[model samples]
Target: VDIIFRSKLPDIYIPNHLPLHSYCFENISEFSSRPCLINGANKQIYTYADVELNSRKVAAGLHKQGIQPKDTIMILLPNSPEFVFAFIGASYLGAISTMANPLFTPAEVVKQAKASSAKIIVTQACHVNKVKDYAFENDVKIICIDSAPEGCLHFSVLTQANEHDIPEVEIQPDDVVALPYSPKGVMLTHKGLVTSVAQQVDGENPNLYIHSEDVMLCVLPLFHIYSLNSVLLCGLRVGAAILIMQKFDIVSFLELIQSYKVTIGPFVPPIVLAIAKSPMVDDYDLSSVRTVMSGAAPLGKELEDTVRAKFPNAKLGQGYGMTEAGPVLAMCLAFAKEPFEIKSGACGTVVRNAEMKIVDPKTGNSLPRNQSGEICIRGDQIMKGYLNDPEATARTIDKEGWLYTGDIGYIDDDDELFIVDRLK
Candidate 1:
């Protein structure tokens, strides 16, 4: 018999029709004066107001440069304030921001830019040369966030533009806002991102309870859907203070958490492994952390127990997601402020506003609880489709809109998900 699982908690309200930027900043007035983004490396801070105002300026600049609604702009920088500005700015003008990994070679960068049909490339001087040839040949403009090379425009030009010059662009809920390269551009729409974020933070008892006072540690690359949606977008939606780190360094990571009194640490398994086994961890005071949420890969139960022992005060949890799933499927309900007790290895409950099913691989039939099978999901949180590839898109999301996750897992009697392995 086919079996389906739903969120244990009541489905919370979600603002599914709002633009991505508006929804993220909807509650900004409540924490406008509070520190929003803190630069861990240089100690520079951007208050909530600064981020909002600068993003508008960036939109105005892009508008002046002839970027219209639905046009694509590629952000090719490391995790920085500029990345945030460029992203939100594009949203302001109804332009899609396609994020590329800073470490990608010139060919890789050009490939994604071409795939997304990007007209402008936002990057730093260090990477301008590698991509500039393609940019010029393709009539793509280069806007460097750092010092501009001979043929590039400076990033300051965007931030310094007058907000009044920003073009008025109407953004629909279904409009594509982000296209992060994951071999191919994953088209994340406004409704999809807003719905996913609201599912976690909007309800009376939020699934991922982040408060205005809580500081989030943001060391993961913004290009990855995991951090972009779960960490940056979700944190911004709830008015949490985000401490941005350029790159991960063990000593610096620990020191920033201590100094900033970081309350939420969203990490991958490798970081968790380092924290659990490193003797250097003993030297730092990590008492302020209230939650350690792991994702990107499966976290072993043994490592979870060890990390729990290391930071006993914090709740240790896991979130399961994929780029096509708007990067969140299940998150440990135990991370909520008013949380439920859950098993260590479980992938929490299905996120509110979504439905999950386990299907038999050979027969393409749904299975009952405790039976492992191919995991399938259906919700507004799922991606619209792959950019410019309808055949690939159709193969992933069926006519009924159920997304074949390609991940093998099962839902237990408790409604918790346990991922066993990948299908291929």
Candidate 2:
């Protein structure tokens, strides 16, 4: 499909639309000293140059193993510098990264790996047996982060090989970089939802502005779609520095902002409540937190105002989404305001790159702007259909290419979007 853009921002410029390898390596040397990621355990930091180089070694390791693009690989780890390296490494080879929660039972891990048709599984040494118990294949390869098991490969192999002289590979715009087990049209949704929504909002406009200087709080698990696409990928596309955190320790989180000088926070509602209610929040310097974006769950107007009260200098707003709906049906345009204003509980307007139309769920007839019904979305960032599940794919994305987001909302006369819970 030949896609056309109306502006200077080419498709390749989008983070999700291109291989991460391309951007990180574009000026590898220039970013050598800048902190790319931070590991809270010992306060270890990985530079952008370090991450890019290590990811290359990972790509090389995977390539040497004969793993190719379109092949599914499972990555089971918590938030760590290693997780970032290994995932991007897999994607650089055109391979898909299926992220699994490290805490899941062996049975659960195996079930998802098997369903995704994964060939190799990557995990830490602590979780070997959990992975081995249901590997599905007797000979499935294992890659580990900590101690390398006798038969297992060390995750460090990717980082240790070569940093200065890594090879390059060509990638397409639609390549699947990461995959997390999304509930089958129920329990989950892929992380690409925000990317899809972003695409539809910006359309072909080249100057659609969110850029790389923006720093997104990596407090949300990269495993979730809302944070993955909307926050992380969104930041990377613009060449932004992503401050990584293993877990949400409020004290440390505040310190990260003070130290890293973070700009954008693509938050979920629970965090919004925490920042609003936590007594310890006042102890730290949060001047760097420019925008607070709450999503995943709805944040009522009261809670929203509470957060706004805390960050008087910052813009507070909501992002309406679910695991599906490309995760973001709408985001607060108020937060994107140059001199952004705090819009209590407003999910903002439909993103500029996306199109939203409400339709009758029962009869499938389109509804006018002011009327609420099932929310539908269409965009480039939409998944190429759920992996190997055509029936589910057909049910979610209609023949006309509009994805039935299963959400309910209506546009205001001012063209603002306000989402209601998804329609059953």
Candidate 3:
């Protein structure tokens, strides 16, 4: 197999410090009146300023209960305003948030909860049973929204509480934020798959600057990193409203977009493909979509071309990621403001401000561009290794700080990235 190495990287800028909660607070006065999120079920809307104020209440509630920095909080709800408030609120106070899929089996929930060493869980009323079962078994506290049982604590009590003081603890850049609540780092050799592939690939980072002018589509499950980091957190970071969809329904999704005027967001390959291929898409006025991102699966060029054909006015791009690689490794260049341009099919240009390398899995030597191997990354956005498995963490992120993405991809002439099937 041919291996490619990066001789020169594009000039990109990364933030000196990860503020975690500063994005929302940065431009609070500018887009305060804009809709931050639109609820798909109830059509309830929240403004950017509303999101900011409520998240503080959530932080205050946690602080009032004496929750401290680095403490773990479990989030077990569908995409909603509550999810955003609690998540950003926890980060503001230097707490680690572990998001769990509400659809998981009871055993699955318990396994991840125990593995992450979470002390408190925040879930909806419907999911209270599983939390109760797991918390009772593991000695953790349960916090629920809408439906608190006799003994369980209500989530609203914390978020709606009157506390406004910021916590006294300091947050460090290297501190763990999102906990790993799912399996990651696929072994390429599981079947006929090549475990190791080409190396020295460039990918994107999920850390983003959310703004009040932004409206995120929470169609992707909040538990997934794509939604957690890229959309949900990205929205809250900037004080943007996150349109919460209890479940993804394409018809309702399209209607909501026009209704809310959502300007920027992410998508999976399938949605992109559907939009590209389905002539029915022409019926909706998509002029409001400023930027569209695709990930969680491969996007084909034909489908991408179809989308561009229809929405000729929107900026379109794709992201490459896996659940373990902190969700996103690279995003498209089209979304970059300047000094970056879009390349088709290639997952995206390496996110500005992150370091990347591709290497031969066997030799550990970096490879040259256009050659395929294993893609490895090192940056602030990556996880602090896996939750409870040192060996796994050590294997994924090496002593040199390189994170083995276990994905097979190559960088093109313009510094954009593309993913191939597993390589040996």
Candidate 4:
């Protein structure tokens, strides 16, 4: 029998028609005064209103610098409030923001910059020297968040600009907003990201319930799609305050959780293992955490149970995604405020408004429920395509719009997804 699966919750209305910045900041008044971003490094806070206003100013500054709609701006920074401002600022002008790892070598950075045709780069002074020569050679403008290195523009030039100076620009749902490199660049459209965010947090009964009162931990790098979309964007969409940690030190991680009363943690499996097994966990009060969602790598049932034992009050679950799938294909419904009884190893149910199938590896035919095969997903949440690589794009997304995720998994009778292995 042909088989497909969807969320048990009714599909929510995703504002796919709006620009990314507008959709994410849609209900601003609801939590305008609430803390939206807390810099873990210095205990600095930026309220929702502050973030929105600064982002607009950044947009205005970019416009003043001649950045037009659809132009590509490369953001090469660590997880900071500036990253948020620069990214959403690009969204305001309908420009695409491509994020690259701050630690990448000069060669690697330039390679991606060239690949994305990035006309501007926003970075810190420490890493600017590596790319300065190449940027100058290519006429790529550099904006540094710290003291301007002689020839570079200061980030204050953007944040200090008048928000009223922001030019009116039209943005479409299909417009590409982010070009995050995943081996190759994945072209993520405004609709794709908004749809993904809504799938997790928009419905009356949200799949991933993030409350305005919730303090989310964002130690995961913002450049990665997992953290960029799920942790940062999703948190912003729900009006939840995010605690941004520059780097993950186990002791510091636990301290922040206790100090801030961090309620939601989106982590990778490695971090989950650390929390589950570390003796240091005994030093902190972790009762504040209500949900712990792990992704980017697999979590074993043994590790999951161990984590459960450590934080009995919190729900522990996994989300499965790929960069090309707007980063989230499935999330643990048990993480929802209105919870479900989910098994430890399950990859949760397929996201709402999406279809999932298991296809035979050898014959490429759809497999029925409970049968392990290549996992396939179809949804508006999928990426526009790999940037400028139609042949590669065609290979991934077929004519029917089904994205052949290389993952091997199956949907059981309960509609829960389980992964056995990856095809490659």
Candidate 5:
């Protein structure tokens, strides 16, 4: 018998039957006029109502541009309001959005483009050259976010279509909404994302309590599943204000938090280090921050304790995730409304509605409390599979639906997860 770990909180009903866009905007009327996106570069803001309408218009525009259901569109841009609009718009049409790093070389960009069979490439002017020839030869359209060069279409084409003109499409829970890859392409379904988001924010006493008025820091690249699911999708689900920062400049970061009164910060370990070590941190009023969620790598217990002085009002803790586990396996219970006692270096307790087991890597038998081994998780939140690679999928996720994380970690008596090593 396996020794499974669960969250300290109870599970709640998750309406994953709805599509990704609908699931995210299910309570739109409650905070329609509230700010949704804060464009850090220009200080521009978009309300929840504005965001939803624009996303619908973009869906119509993409349809007008020949994007049909199930077709994949490549999104190659930094964190911005446009990125959000294009992503949500794709979900509306039951289309899949494959996000690519804009800084990749032409060959690197084209490989993923070719791999995902991206019908359209949405990017900035500078990144167009990398995909131009390949897109032209493959009959793919290049849509630029800024001023379009030569044959490239402007982003306006996706925003100019009539919102009411969107074509009707039935969205299934299993339908792929986003294609985040491992160079092999990881397919994430609507059900998977909805389940993941709901696990963190849906319960009566949610594991992570992000609210409509909370301004979330979205400096991390959205191409990463952690940022997309936790910051954008989770923030949207709660009508939170997400401040999108294209690049991380310490001064600008601190200034934004102070000016926006940012309440939640989902940061990586490096960002945590920068905040803790910088002498300039003392000058900023980071007291507005209420929760500091760290991940992407582990932060030492010493480092975690050190950073607390930097954000006096924040509840600091880490979460465990990987691109394959629908990205999140667990989150800090300290983020809960009625917070729990958390260890300094603990990643978190396994997220609610999921089963987590730490197994011996060599024996394949599940380990008991205090034992460390490979981490395996089972739940709807995990990815369906690596796209088109059944062998790889099977290798990762067994027949019983357990996805082996290839990570070394242990579940303590308190049910907190402590990552020891990454197999890779």
Candidate 6:
């Protein structure tokens, strides 16, 4: 018999049938007047009302530019409010958004643009030259955020459109909402994204507790699944104010936290390392920060302890995930509204509303407690499949709907997950 693992928290109903944009804003009326997006660089703020209207406007704008349902739009941008507008706008139109870092080379941008079959590109003027030749030649329209270059359209064309002008299109659950590159395009459907966000922020006692009053630091790139699903989508779900930063600087990060009284910080190991080593860290008041979650890479036990001393009031720990797993596989229980006792070096328990199992790599049979093996997960929160690559998808997701993670791990006596090594 195969042994399976489940979360200590009870499963709650997830409205997975809704589109991503609708699901995120489902609780909008509860925090309609609250601050939703705060730009770290320019200090501009957009409330929930502002965000929704603008997103609808952008959808209308995208439609005006001939973007149709199932069409892909490339958001080759830095961290900005417009990025949020563009992504959600595409969702409203039942279109797909494939995000790329602004720093990507011309060839790299073109590669993704061509691969995703992108119809339009939203970016800044400086990055225009990168995709200039390829975009123009492919009949792809480039919409510049700042001043328009010679052949590019201005971003205002989308932002200035009337929100009511949007076309009413039926958004299906299986329709891909995001196409994030994980060396290959990872197709994230509306149901998959909605399920992932709900697993974290929905429930009687949320796995991760964020409220309308809490201010979240969103310095992580929105292009990445971790920041996209957990940070942006989850924050929006609960109406938490998301502070967007274009780039990360030790001083800027600290100052934003102090100024905004930021409560939730979803970070990577490098940012935690910077806070621990920086001589200037003690100068700022980070006491307002209550949660410091590190992921994408493992944070050493010693390093976790060192960082703990700096943020006296914060709960510091790791959240384990993979992009192919719809980004979040597990999160620290210490972040739970009703917290659990978290151990050092433990990634976290598997998230609620999901099933996890550790299996022998050689045997493909599920293993028992404290035994290390390949980690596999099954849930609505996982990806629909790899984009247009059923062979690779079949290799990752089995006939039983379980997604086999190549990483090795074990569930301890306390039900905490500890990773062992990566499978070659």
TM per prediction: 0.97, 0.84, 0.84, 0.97, 0.98, 0.98
Where does the lowest 10-residue lDDT sum fall in candidate 5? 298-307
Task: Write model 1 residue lDDT over 1-424, tens digit each, in one string.
Answer: 3466788878877888889999999999999999999999999999999999999999999998889999999999888999999999999999999998889888888899899999899998999877888998889999998788988999988999998888777789889999986676799999999989988887988998998999999998898888888889999998999999988877898999899989988877778777776778988788899998876776687777766776657888877888998979888989876888898678878988888898897998888899889889889998999998889999999887889889998988888899989646
Tell me the whole-model lDDT of each prediction, alpha carbons only. 0.88, 0.64, 0.66, 0.89, 0.90, 0.91
Model 2 off-target regions past 4 Å? 1-20, 23-33, 162-170, 185-214, 322-325, 337-343
Ranked by TM-score, the better of candidates 1 and 6 is: 6
**Candidate 1: residue 415 Cα off by (Å):** 0.4
Candidate 3 at 154: error in angstroms? Answer: 2.3
Worst 10 residues of 4 by lDDT: 1-10
Q: Which of candidates 1 and 6 reaches a greater lDDT? A: 6
In candidate 4 the C-alpha lDDT for residue 265 amounts to 79
lDDT of 3: 0.66
User: Which sections of candidate 5 miss by over 4 Å?
Assistant: none
Candidate 6 deviant stretches above 4 angstroms? none
TM-score for predicted model 5 compared with the true structure? 0.98
**lDDT for each residue of candidate 4 in 1-424, tens digit (9 for 90 to 100):** 4566778777878778888898999999999999999999899999999999999999999988888999999999999999999999999999999999999999999999999999899999999988899999999999999878988999999999888987777789999999999768899999999999999898888999888999999999999988999889999998999999988888889999999999987777778777876788987788898898886676677777766776667888887888998889998889876888888678888899888888998998898888889988999999999988999999999999999989898888888989999658
Query: What is the Å distance of residue 317 in model 5 from its true position?
Result: 0.3
Worst 10 residues of 1 by lDDT: 1-10
In angstroms, the error of model 1 at 101 is 1.1
| Candidate 3 segments exceeding 4 Å error | 1-18, 184-212, 237-240, 272-282, 323-326, 339-341, 422-424
- CA error at residue 318 for candidate 6, angstroms: 1.3
How many residue pairs clash per model?
0, 16, 30, 0, 0, 0
Tell me model 4's lDDT, rounded to 2 decimals: 0.89
Tens digit of lDDT per residue, candidate 3, span 1-424?
Answer: 3242331334334332444565435556777777776788898877777777888889988877666887777788888777877877787787777788888887878777776677888887777777687688777888887778866888877877775576666666555556645564121110000000001111132223234666777888877766766676456545567788888666777787788777775777667766665666789887777777774665567766765665556677676766555555666655543325556677775554456778876887888878777898765456666655779888888886778878777887777787886433
Residue 130 local lDDT, model 5: 93
Error of 4 at 420 (Å): 1.2
